[PDB]
């Protein structure tokens, strides 16, 4: 079904954000695992998986709309060097992601692509859940201290 | 069954305390969940539900006694800004509650409303168990330290 | 995540409506149970529980957006004195609630808070189901007569 | 299998009748559900489903006989404005339906299309059971009164 | 264990009320069954059984306190001749019975027979549950009308 | 609940489209079954059923909004004469249907009937799935050839 | 455990190849699904997953050996425009991957990193299986014809 060119461009922009997040969250997960922080490693793995699922749906939607999904262009990974930085890099990525999501929803609405909007809204709900998680972790580091915080994420 | 007017006033006073506590504990529970202190949030949720059940039984007793239950006149919620203060706000509300319970029981006994007395005594037992919980948490904060206490309440 | 100030104000207004409904439906339920109209009492109890679940989600969303949920202010309960009046009181409350939900949705849309919009839309669907139930009961009273209507709501 | 042209015309007329009845019964069912008369709504739904199954067998038979099933021409729906009229409208439709079925069976017999006769006889048995139901409901309205009759059809 | 002479007189007074109630409710049950009001009959049967159980516990307590249970003196049965009258006779009996239970409890408290008081408090809770049932039935008769009320009690 | 008059007009137009689709898909299904293309027949049968369910929800919504569902007017069925034409006929109908759904959604949004909008969005999601199916079948005919395409749809 | 610098460079180069393959196979999978070639889509999806698992193990080895996994640099995807091209593009990528795997194994053997060699040998075995699958498909297209080949890959 011939989709709107600018909707397809927005969907590819969203997909690009997801493809960064897949790699960033996966590397962070494996870094936390390598350091023995397996509860962080496991949770971050699941966040990577969720972004893979979102990317799948974006790819399927773009193809349905007779556009070309762009898996070639990979933007900049925001990789941290310690736990606090890694969590803040994830949060910085997610805040960029939700901005792009809202702007894409605006355009979907304007051209009456209500199904694409609904997909983007569902992704937006998942990204906001991830922001909640990250902001919560950063706060917990302040409330319990970093040493306790890391201790609590050693074991699953 | 036509009840004693002052018994009904006492029951409405106890009901009004339960209505305060329902909201205060519910909000405290949600705050703790939002901060990632999910063990506190779940416990405080169960306290809120327990107060809901007491409010139900009071409403039912008042109507049996041909009174008008008063769910309109909400008193002041004691909301803290940190865990220590929230625990102390809960404890302060519970001391007011048990004082008012004792006085209502005195009056039930005087007018021979032994069934209302038995209900209030059961509520009093529940509120004293809540006081023991609160006093114990405030004591653990001293013994284990605030950061450890919070760390032990991150996960359910 | 820092939410829009007016969204949080709209969310607290919807919550304020839900807090009224919880108490109004819970009281109506227990009055119907006291009168032996147990099917009305049970249905109205589930209406109250559903408002409780809505208030929960509103509180959780307000806190995620870094607002302060307002459980202190309680508006006017519309308590009827008989079954026709109680049903009409519930319907009056619900029509005010849905007016406020639509105005809140408009504003969420304009500030691109599509997740809050989705929450409010789900609450609105539930409120329109309750309106359908209420209008149907009022119509049944006309079709079968008040004495039959009440007879049919004696047993659960 | 090339069938008799007049038989096919009869089958298309009966199909026409079933198509009216599908839509009339489905609308009546949903009106009754909207009014809170769920037992009537459910029974009328099942009547609609039964006519849908008859239309399916007529369509299949016409196609086997190398005719063109006519799903395009929809005759007049008889929609009531209250229960009493709705039942009589269904009954008026059924009486037309059975008169046409009998004339079709006569023609099937004359041209030795004994299988089409058997299909039509089975549909006729279904329509006579529907007439039995409808006559019985209208008799019950007289015996128990309209308010009782309607009361008895509120719940499933 | 030697009991207080006046407590034992109070226990025998309450026993005498239960013994009246056993027979009045049993006969009312069986009258209602004979009339085809089987839901009233079954419920009144269970009220009789509950009174039998209270009488058992009272007999048992009196004998432990080395008194003589008086099963000889049977007070006046209040036997109605129609449903509304029967319920009012049960209610009248229950109000006399709860008056006596309150007076007996006062004296147990005075002489420190706190186990006997607790037994009597349990019995009083059951009698106040029965008062609630009776008052509700009489109210229902007014709200749905006698003919409907009886109709709803033909079948279990 | 008093619906917007123009929303109700839109809902009746979408309902009108669904009623065409029910009949067209049902007839196409039974043609495919008569020709021995049972997998196409069963798939198209399920498309018809899906449209019946949409029609049901529209009828229910219209009645709730105190409008009159129009089941009397039946637009033009697009009946193909072979498999390729039948699929393209279905696709032409779906493309009209989604255009009308988008226009209906626009109006629902502008008058704040967000629940009607949500219903229509869910139907649009189902219609866009049906467009994907149809486009895919027509593309498969080109990729595997008509004879293989039909062969692959002989058996369920 | 500090690893050999060039071993790690070899591992990051194999990882780069796997990252290309992940995206190339996932896009090809979703293209085939969009075209209705669901058996090809499913198989190509599992090929993508298996490269994902290979990339995970490579990332985990690199981190253990105290190197930095490079998920930032993404080589050239070879995307076909039809089934035959897509299979050949996959095969071209696999032939490059196996050449790079052999050279890496040579180096691991020379510096005695036997565990890295064993990991790469396992990956090589999987890639040779993929080569086998791809050459076989290309051969089948010649043997059965493209239309039959595609036909056989419509349905899982
Ligand atoms: C801020 C106001 C309130 C909130 C946010 C709230 C929240 C909740 C929630 C989330 C539940 C559990 C529902 C479920 O099972 O999913 C619940 C249950 C319940 N609520 Fe409330 N509630 C409120 C006020 C009240 C009040 C005022 C009453 C009584 C007057 C009440 C009576 C009950 C009862 C009896 C239950 C059943 C609990 C059980 O037995 O499991 N609630 N409430
Ligand atoms: C009019 C006089 C009475 C009648 C007609 C009557 C009738 C009955 C009946 C029909 C049952 C059910 C037995 C069964 O089928 O298993 C029963 C149970 C019983 N009755 Fe009576 N009864 C009478 C008096 C009494 C008295 C005076 C007492 C005690 C002093 C008593 C104590 C009990 C007890 C303890 C049970 C067992 C209840 C249970 O646990 O189910 N009854 N009676
Ligand atoms: C107003 C138009 C129609 C409406 C609203 C309607 C509605 C429905 C509904 C709601 C169902 C149940 C679906 C499910 O939950 O599984 C159904 C089933 C069915 N419909 Fe219709 N329908 C319509 C017209 C037709 C027509 C014209 C035909 C055939 C010519 C038909 C044939 C069928 C059949 C065969 C079934 C399955 C019944 C069974 O065996 O259980 N419908 N319909
Ligand atoms: C275009 C980029 C990618 C897409 C679209 C994608 C998609 C998917 C999907 C749909 C799943 C299945 C999730 C589920 O339903 O359970 C999955 C699983 C997985 N992915 Fe990815 N992925 C991508 C990139 C990556 C990368 C870069 C890695 C690691 C380097 C990776 C590692 C994994 C792993 C380990 C699994 C679990 C598979 C299993 O064992 O079942 N993926 N991916
Ligand atoms: O309700 C209808 N039923 C039909 O059959 C029909 C049409 N016919 C198309 C057709 C299909 C064939 O295989 C063969 C022929 Cl000659 C015709 C057209 C409009 C409406 C209807
Ligand atoms: O397709 C149709 N849908 C309808 O509603 C309808 C009719 N309506 C009768 C009616 C029912 C009411 O409750 C109230 C009114 Cl004033 C009218 C009549 C013919 C055809 C149709």
> CA distances (Å), A130 to each of A79, A127, B75, E83, in order?
17, 5, 37, 65
CB-CB contact of F126 with F69 (8 Å):
no
Closest CA to A21 of A89, A81, A122, A101: A89
Closest CA to A129 of A54, A20, A65, A33: A54
Q: CA angle at residue A57 from A54 to A62, to 5 degrees?
A: 125
Burial class (CB in 10 A: 0-12, 13-18, 19+), B42: middle
CB-CB contact of A48 with G56 (8 Å):
no
Write out C12-52 in H/E/C secondary structure.
Answer: HHHHHHHHHHHHHHHHHHHHHHHCCCHHHHHHHHHHHHHHH
User: Three-state DSSP class for C120?
Assistant: helix
Site to probe by mutation for ligand 1, drawn from C14, C21, C24, C52 as the one with most ligand atoms within 8 Å of Cβ, is: C52
Q: What is the rounded CA–CA span in Å between residue B69 and residue B7?
A: 12
Resolution for this experimental structure (Å): 2.0
Q: Which chains touch C (3 or more CB pairs under 8 A)?
A: A, B, D, E, F
Q: What is the rounded CA–CA span in Å between residue B134 and residue B125?
A: 14
CB-CB contact of A58 with A69 (8 Å):
yes
Pairwise CB contact (< 8 Å): F34 & D63: yes
Q: What is the rounded CA–CA span in Å between residue B41 and residue B25?
A: 9
What residue spans of chain D are helical by DSSP H? Answer: 5-34, 38-64, 83-110, 114-144, 146-151
User: Three-state DSSP class for D81?
Assistant: coil
Q: What is the rounded CA–CA span in Å between residue C141 and residue C152?
A: 11
Q: What is the rounded CA–CA span in Å between residue D22 and residue A27?
A: 60
CB-CB contact of G123 with G54 (8 Å):
yes
Pairwise CB contact (< 8 Å): B23 & C72: yes
Token pair in block for residue F47: 């498309």
User: Would you mind telling me the total number of residues written for chain G in this entry?
Assistant: 156
Tokens 């005195």 correspond to: B106
- How far is the alpha carbon of G45 from chain F, nearest alpha carbon, in Å? 19
CB-CB contact of C105 with C124 (8 Å):
yes
Token pair in block for residue C129: 């189901």
To test the contact with chain B by mutation, choose from C19, C21, C29, C30 the residue with the greatest count of B C-beta atoms within 10 A, namely C30
Tally of CB atoms within 10 A around G89: 19
Closest CA to D90 of D103, D71, D104, D77: D77
| C-alpha torsion angle, residues E75, E80, E85, E88 (rounded to 10) | 20
Tally of CB atoms within 10 A around C109: 17
CB-CB contact of F18 with F48 (8 Å):
no
For ligand 4, atom 7, the nearest C-alpha belongs to: A52
Pairwise CB contact (< 8 Å): A56 & G30: yes
Q: What is the rounded CA–CA span in Å between residue G38 and residue G30?
A: 9
| C-alpha torsion angle, residues E140, E141, E142, E148 (rounded to 10) | 100
In chain F, the residue whose alpha carbon lies closest to the alpha carbon of G82 is F143
- Please provide residue F80's backbone torsions phi and psi, each rounded to the nearest 5 degrees: -75, 170
CB-CB contact of B1 with E128 (8 Å):
yes
Token pair in block for residue E112: 């420190």
Tokens 């064993």 correspond to: G118
> CA distances (Å), A77 to each of C105, C154, G52, G73, in order?
36, 66, 18, 10
Residue C100: partners with Cβ closer than 8 Å, 6 or more residues away: C10, C13, C14, C17
Closest CA to G34 of F131, F149, A60: A60
Q: What is the rounded CA–CA span in Å between residue D50 and residue D17?
A: 13
User: Three-state DSSP class for F36?
Assistant: coil
- Please provide residue C54's backbone torsions phi and psi, each rounded to the nearest 5 degrees: -60, -45
Distance of CA G94 to the CA centre of its chain: 6
Tally of CB atoms within 10 A around G45: 18
To test the contact with chain A by mutation, choose from G45, G71, G73 the residue with the greatest count of A C-beta atoms within 10 A, namely G71
Closest CA to C100 of C26, C4, C16: C16
Closest CA to F123 of F91, F100, F106, F107: F100
For ligand 3, atom 6, the nearest C-alpha belongs to: F52
Closest CA to F26 of A141, A39, D72: D72
Burial class (CB in 10 A: 0-12, 13-18, 19+), D131: middle
- Please provide residue C76's backbone torsions phi and psi, each rounded to the nearest 5 degrees: -75, 125
CB-CB contact of B33 with C60 (8 Å):
yes
Q: What is the DSSP letter of D3?
A: P
| F72-93 as b/e: b if 16+ CB within 10 A | bebbebbbbeebeebbebbbeb
The reply to whether A33 sits in an annotated binding site is no
Method underlying the structure = X-ray
Q: What is the rounded CA–CA span in Å between residue F20 and residue D74?
A: 11
Q: What is the DSSP letter of F72?
A: S
In chain C, the residue whose alpha carbon lies closest to the alpha carbon of F114 is C121
> CA distances (Å), E111 to each of B131, D43, E12, E58, G58, in order?
33, 68, 17, 18, 85
Whether residue F53 has its Cβ less than 6 Å from ligand 3: yes
CB-CB contact of G36 with F87 (8 Å):
no
- Please provide residue B40's backbone torsions phi and psi, each rounded to the nearest 5 degrees: -65, -40
Axis crossing angle, helix E83-110 with helix E114-144, rounded to the nearest 10: 160
First-to-final CA distance of chain E: 46
The reply to whether E17 sits in an annotated binding site is no
Q: What is the DSSP letter of F81?
A: S
First-to-final CA distance of chain B: 46
Tally of CB atoms within 10 A around E56: 12
Q: How far is the CA of G29 from the centre of ligand 4 (A)?
A: 13
Instruction: Give the count of alpha carbons within 13 A of A39, CB side only.
Output: 11
Token pair in block for residue E11: 């226990």
Residue G21: partners with Cβ closer than 8 Å, 6 or more residues away: G47, G48, G51, G90, G93, G94, G97
User: Three-state DSSP class for B13?
Assistant: helix
Site to probe by mutation for ligand 5, drawn from F25, F32, F79 as the one with most ligand atoms within 8 Å of Cβ, is: F79
Distance of CA G95 to the CA centre of its chain: 9
Task: Tell which atom from ligand 6 comes closest to the C-alpha of F70.
Answer: 1
Token pair in block for residue F36: 């021995």
Distance of CA E113 to the CA centre of its chain: 23
Distance of CA B154 to the CA centre of its chain: 24
Tokens 């819970």 correspond to: C26
CB pairs under 8 A between D and F: 49
Residue F45: partners with Cβ closer than 8 Å, 6 or more residues away: F25, F26, F29
Provide the chain C residues 26-55 that lie in CB contact (below 8 A) with chain B.
26-27, 30-31, 33-34
Token pair in block for residue E127: 């009698």
CB-CB contact of D13 with D107 (8 Å):
no
CB-CB contact of C11 with C62 (8 Å):
yes
DSSP state letters, C49-109: HHHHHHHHHHHHHHHHTT-----S--------SSHHHHHHHHHHHHHHHHHHHHHHHHHHH
| F2-40 as b/e: b if 16+ CB within 10 A | ebbeebbebbbbbbbbbbbbbbbbbbbbbbbbbbebbbb
Does residue E130 sit at the C interface (CB-CB below 8 Å)? no
Q: CA angle at residue E153 from E149 to E154, to 5 degrees?
A: 120
User: Would you mind telling me the total number of residues written for chain B in this entry?
Assistant: 156
Closest CA to G10 of G129, G130, G126, G109: G109
Token pair in block for residue E77: 């049965």
């Amino acid at each position: 079904m011939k989709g709107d060119k600018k909707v397809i461009q927005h969907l590819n922009k969203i997909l690009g954000n997801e493809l960064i997040a897949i790699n960033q969250y996966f590397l962070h997960s494996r870094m936390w695992n390598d350091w023995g922080l397996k509860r962080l490693g496991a949770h971050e793995y699941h966040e990577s998986i969720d972004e893979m699922k979102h990317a799948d749906k974006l790819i399927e939607r773009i193809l349905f709309l007779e556009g070309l999904p762009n898996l070639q262009d990979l933007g900049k990974l925001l990789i941290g060097e310690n736990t606090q930085e890694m969590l803040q890099c994830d949060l910085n990525l997610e805040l960029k992601a939700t901005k792009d999501l809202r702007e894409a929803i605006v355009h979907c609405e304007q051209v009456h692509d209500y199904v694409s909007r609904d997909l983007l809204k569902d992704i937006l709900e998942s990204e906001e859940e991830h922001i909640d998680y990250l902001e919560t972790q950063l706060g917990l580091i302040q409330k319990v201290g970093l040493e306790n915080y890391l201790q609590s994420h050693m074991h699953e």
